[PDB]
Design a protein around this nucleic acid. Sequence first.
RNA 1: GAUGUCGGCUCAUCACAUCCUGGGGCUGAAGUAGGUCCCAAGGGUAUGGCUGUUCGCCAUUUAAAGUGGUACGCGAGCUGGGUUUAGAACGUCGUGAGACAGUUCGGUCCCUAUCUGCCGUGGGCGCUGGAGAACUGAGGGGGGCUGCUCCUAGUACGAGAGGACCGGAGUGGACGCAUCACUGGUGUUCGGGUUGUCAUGCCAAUGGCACUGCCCGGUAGCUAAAUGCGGAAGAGAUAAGUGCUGAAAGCAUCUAAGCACGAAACUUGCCCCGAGAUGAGUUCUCCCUGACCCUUUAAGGGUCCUGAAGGAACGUUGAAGACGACGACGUUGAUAGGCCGGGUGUGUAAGCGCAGCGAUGCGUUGAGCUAACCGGUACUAAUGAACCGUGAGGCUUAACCUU
RNA 2: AAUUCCUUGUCGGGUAAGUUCCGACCUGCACGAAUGGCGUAAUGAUGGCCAGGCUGUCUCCACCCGAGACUCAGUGAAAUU
RNA 3: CACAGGUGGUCAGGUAGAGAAUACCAAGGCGCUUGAGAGAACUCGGGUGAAGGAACUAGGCAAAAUGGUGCCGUAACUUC
RNA 4: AGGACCGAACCGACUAAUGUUGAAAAAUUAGCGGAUGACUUGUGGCUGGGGGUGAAAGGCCAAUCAAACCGGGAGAUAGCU
Lengths: 122, 5, 120, 114, 56, 209
Amino acid sequence: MIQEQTMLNVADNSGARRVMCIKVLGGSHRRYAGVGDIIKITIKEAIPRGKVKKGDVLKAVVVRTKKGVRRPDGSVIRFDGNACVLLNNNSEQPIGTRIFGPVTRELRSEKFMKIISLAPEV
Amino acid sequence: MFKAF
Amino acid sequence: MRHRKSGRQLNRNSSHRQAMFRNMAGSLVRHEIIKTTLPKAKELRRVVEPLITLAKTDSVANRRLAFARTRDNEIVAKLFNELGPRFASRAGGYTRILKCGFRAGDNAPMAYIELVDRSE
Amino acid sequence: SNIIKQLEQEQMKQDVPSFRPGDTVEVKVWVVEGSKKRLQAFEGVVIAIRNRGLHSAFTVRKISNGEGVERVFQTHSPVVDSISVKRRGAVRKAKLYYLRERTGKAARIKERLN
Amino acid sequence: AVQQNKPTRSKRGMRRSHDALTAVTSLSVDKTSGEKHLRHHITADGYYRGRKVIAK
Amino acid sequence: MIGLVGKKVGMTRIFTEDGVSIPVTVIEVEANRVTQVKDLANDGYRAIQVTTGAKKANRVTKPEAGHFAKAGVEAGRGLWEFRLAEGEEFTVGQSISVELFADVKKVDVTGTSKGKGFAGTVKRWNFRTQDATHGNSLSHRVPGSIGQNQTPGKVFKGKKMAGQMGNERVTVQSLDVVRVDAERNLLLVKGAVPGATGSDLIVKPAVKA
RNA sequence: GAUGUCGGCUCAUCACAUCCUGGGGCUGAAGUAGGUCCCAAGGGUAUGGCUGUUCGCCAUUUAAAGUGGUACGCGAGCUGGGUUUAGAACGUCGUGAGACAGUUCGGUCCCUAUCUGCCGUGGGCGCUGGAGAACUGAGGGGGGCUGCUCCUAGUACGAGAGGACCGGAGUGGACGCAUCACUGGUGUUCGGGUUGUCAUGCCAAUGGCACUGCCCGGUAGCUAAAUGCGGAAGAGAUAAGUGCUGAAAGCAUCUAAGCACGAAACUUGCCCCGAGAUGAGUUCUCCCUGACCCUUUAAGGGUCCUGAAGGAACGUUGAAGACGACGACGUUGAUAGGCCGGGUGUGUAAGCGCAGCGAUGCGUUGAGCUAACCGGUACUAAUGAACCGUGAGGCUUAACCUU
RNA sequence: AAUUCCUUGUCGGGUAAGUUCCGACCUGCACGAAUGGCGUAAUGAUGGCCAGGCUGUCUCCACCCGAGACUCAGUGAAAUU
RNA sequence: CACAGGUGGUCAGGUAGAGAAUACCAAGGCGCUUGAGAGAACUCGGGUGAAGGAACUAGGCAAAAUGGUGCCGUAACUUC
RNA sequence: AGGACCGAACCGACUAAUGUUGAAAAAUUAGCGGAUGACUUGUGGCUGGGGGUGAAAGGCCAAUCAAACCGGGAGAUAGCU
Ligand SMILES: [Mg+2]
Ligand SMILES: [Mg+2]
Ligand SMILES: [Mg+2]
Ligand SMILES: [Mg+2]
Ligand SMILES: [Mg+2]
Ligand SMILES: [Mg+2]
Ligand SMILES: [Mg+2]
Ligand SMILES: [Mg+2]
Ligand SMILES: [Mg+2]
Ligand SMILES: [Mg+2]
Ligand SMILES: [Mg+2]
Ligand SMILES: [Mg+2]
Ligand SMILES: [Mg+2]
Ligand SMILES: [Mg+2]
Ligand SMILES: [Mg+2]
Ligand SMILES: [Mg+2]
Ligand SMILES: [Mg+2]
Ligand SMILES: [Mg+2]
Ligand SMILES: [Mg+2]
Ligand SMILES: [Mg+2]
Ligand SMILES: [Mg+2]
Ligand SMILES: [Mg+2]
Ligand SMILES: [Mg+2]
Ligand SMILES: [Mg+2]
Ligand SMILES: [Mg+2]
Ligand SMILES: [Mg+2]
Ligand SMILES: [Mg+2]
Ligand SMILES: [Mg+2]
Ligand SMILES: [Mg+2]
Ligand SMILES: [Mg+2]
Ligand SMILES: [Mg+2]
Ligand SMILES: [Mg+2]
Ligand SMILES: [Mg+2]
Ligand SMILES: [Mg+2]
């Protein structure tokens, strides 16, 4: 469950360490963004000489959440922390060239096949 | 209690 | 809501409620018949009767368990020496509740609670 | 609830092994890659087990690529094929939720050499 | 919070129409001792269902 | 189309070879004995009166037992009616079992909801709770305003207020029929249904279609 | 001889001069997307930063973030930040006390609801013999939102860029309903760990107190974040509007006669209440088939006999409940407790032995204990009765059964 | 600016967004030198602003333990009219 | 008022503790002059909480949180 | 050494909630300030109403203060209700 004001770690090498969610896109009065959902984020910490810098406003896709992901059989997959992958604001394509940490199958969509291919696990 | 000016 | 819940609170906290039945349970064992309010007598059934069941088999561990629930060596001796053997054949229902009108002081409903083998 | 017992009994998995909290367990789970089915192994420490007959489930924790991961497996689901206990650990508690706060040496579990 | 007009005797009586008490429908008779008592309650002398439940 | 009266045995999980878990409410539908047939010429509407289960013979009033005796049927838990369309007919004493739903994809389930008793506005009507701090005085979860001053000078009918919640007839529509077990008189329907375990339940074909 | 303000919070309700969704006429409307006007109020109609602010600006969303009325809705519902008491200070005015829609820091928000109204829930009586059930549905309420993707189709259109209508499929947001199978919360009534101290003679083992002493887990139940379902199709009559035939008016003309289509509005369809619907309805069963007495001789009163159907009361109680009510059961009995077995939860009891100087470890042992749960079991408590309720049910007319 | 009406002055910093805050400019409506000017370590239940930690303050409330509320017995008010 | 208020001195036990703090106790004195049930809304005093963590609000109000001993170590500014 | 520091008694009263026909005509609960001093406290004494006293709030002077309380002038006066 990702809301506004929640802090998320960055699971890609775009240069940002942790970002700040400022909007849950895709509806009116929508308040939660699970795995595979796009959110509007603002970078809070970033590494020097990266391709993104502090204060940038972009959008990212949630790839890991503490609340976890529910499977058809009732199984639930939980992660120790929330993570997201930064995407270009206009084209909604990943900015980083490598993904960090496990990825979840729910992002198996044409728009996120790039992340799945670059993911280290599943 | 209340005032009205 | 109170769906499928058990146990009367009796307008007391857990500590007071537990202490009251420990004393009342010993009283019923010491005195084969006592007088108390009807709701309390019904609640007492769930305390004294398990103790009698424990006394069915006499062992050091069981006696220590009985002591922890009564904290009275005299009651423990009564449970294992007399009450246990007497109710060796009964499968539960070691106590009987009898209603005896209302309390004069506050009109509370009173009822006698006694062991079923008091006949002598 | 004899009706539920019969309905659940008829569909309960039979080859479920014996495992306890703190033992390292590897679970084979079916994963669907398009039309072709596949098996992948998830190995970790069993930190919680609930026994409810057909509804029984257990939780496995592992550290993958520097990220902690927890999976709650439904034991009797067809998704899981087999359960193998690679290592047996001795713990004093049914639930090992405290392991979530430890890593590395602090997360070690002593083996149960009964 | 408080009344604007004094309610009448009639209104007072109607409100009290439901305050009437109800007498015990009947009193059970012990099979042997013979005293009248409340049903499911022991008699004055401690009898109940034909057995002297209480010594006193 | 004619339905049936069952009992909410409980809730269960059904596994499928594909790996999907279907939560199914188990409904037991014993033989449904028709006790009376309603006719236009005498009653003004076409319907069938049915009874299910059994009840102790010591508590069947001869006004009720005589009704059962008229149809030559054993007294059941209660009496329920189902309207008849143009194409269906039935005879008194006919026994209907669960196979009637064997050809039904979707069913309609009705029953009495769980009784929550006197429920507050927050629970009953999802009213927003007021501030728990910041000076609030004894008004943390009170309804608040209920009117608009002198102009109306009254509370409009149907105002949402605290009151009895639950313990009322509720119908859940378009429930998939997972499996019909005519050898044990059971009906499995996906999802939950109103009422607690062991409560009377009415199952009808999905009117929504 | 008192109608308490701005804003916020909570809860709203109406209007249509309509912001979105729906139906149309024109367009300097190719398409996509717009402009303008007409019909339409069913539903829906942002979170934040700054500021006491409404407002406004800004950030980011949305199909859209409508305009107004309701004491600029709502303080016997909350708040008290702003104005607008007494304190103090700045600038400013005055010789001064003081003063400033100038600015600054601080500053008591009472009321147990009689009536109306409203949300729930009972009693009484009525419905013309009484009683137990199942119903008809006059009426009333609830619900009515919508995105994105795919197909049709890269087709119509266009030089190109770009890119459909009309019809289908899937998956979402918000909202509502139900429920605990799952994932979880809670679980001071279940286990276990541990600090200080007191006590049970002492060791050992336990209990009391310290927020449940502090904590770790947890059954049932409740519950959402959990998972099922819902908005609709269809029908009737229509708004704006487009038409057929067609005269008054040789033509024309959607209209005067006569026909057709036409929207989330309207009447139905779906869900819930419902015969106090006094217009008190219908259907199916059940119960009662005696003596007399009086005059004010009539829907008359009274005595004896009788006490049916059924209900109530009491008792054991409920996933029913503030109390009433409602459901189950009362020995011809599983209603509750206990008991037996099982399942859960905790995690190897106590005792004894074996190792060690000892803390402690190991064996007996997944042991011991185990609340609300599951299947059983009359061991305990649900008494033999009494109580209420009656004894064939008015008149007139009609149609039949008749003598 | 505890002083600035115009005014949310203008510029910079902080924030995705800052009528407040910090720095600077001077066009000081209407600062100014013992009715003291400007600084100032330490101190302050003092005013404003920011960050970490922390959380039911909130998104959005859920459950539980107690005292009332509710029912029974006893006693028995009040404002108002 | 048999009122959660106010009222100056003297005596100063045990375990833990720096202590007349605090916890549990000794001597000693008390259970506070209405009770019994039920386990609804709502109010009061408390406990816990999934994911998020000031998005609340005039304002982090209130809550949560920090909390003891030794030892290591500690910046600008300082009237030293 | 200290109008020194932490912190009980003791003296204070910054915040919140409760209470507001209260248990209480100013309190309770949880926090909070001082706590060797311009400290606090017992007993007795002194200052009297246009006066006292006041580390200054028009505060306090017996639950009363921009002129205390009690009696008297007194049936003040009231173009007002
Ligand atoms: Mg009480
Ligand atoms: Mg305690
Ligand atoms: Mg209920
Ligand atoms: Mg108050
Ligand atoms: Mg409060
Ligand atoms: Mg009027
Ligand atoms: Mg007046
Ligand atoms: Mg409509
Ligand atoms: Mg705004
Ligand atoms: Mg901020
Ligand atoms: Mg107003
Ligand atoms: Mg207001
Ligand atoms: Mg008002
Ligand atoms: Mg103010
Ligand atoms: Mg002026
Ligand atoms: Mg010892
Ligand atoms: Mg400045
Ligand atoms: Mg000056
Ligand atoms: Mg000071
Ligand atoms: Mg009373
Ligand atoms: Mg007293
Ligand atoms: Mg002390
Ligand atoms: Mg309570
Ligand atoms: Mg939380
Ligand atoms: Mg806000
Ligand atoms: Mg605070
Ligand atoms: Mg605290
Ligand atoms: Mg000092
Ligand atoms: Mg100090
Ligand atoms: Mg205090
Ligand atoms: Mg002054
Ligand atoms: Mg005074
Ligand atoms: Mg004179
Ligand atoms: Mg005079």
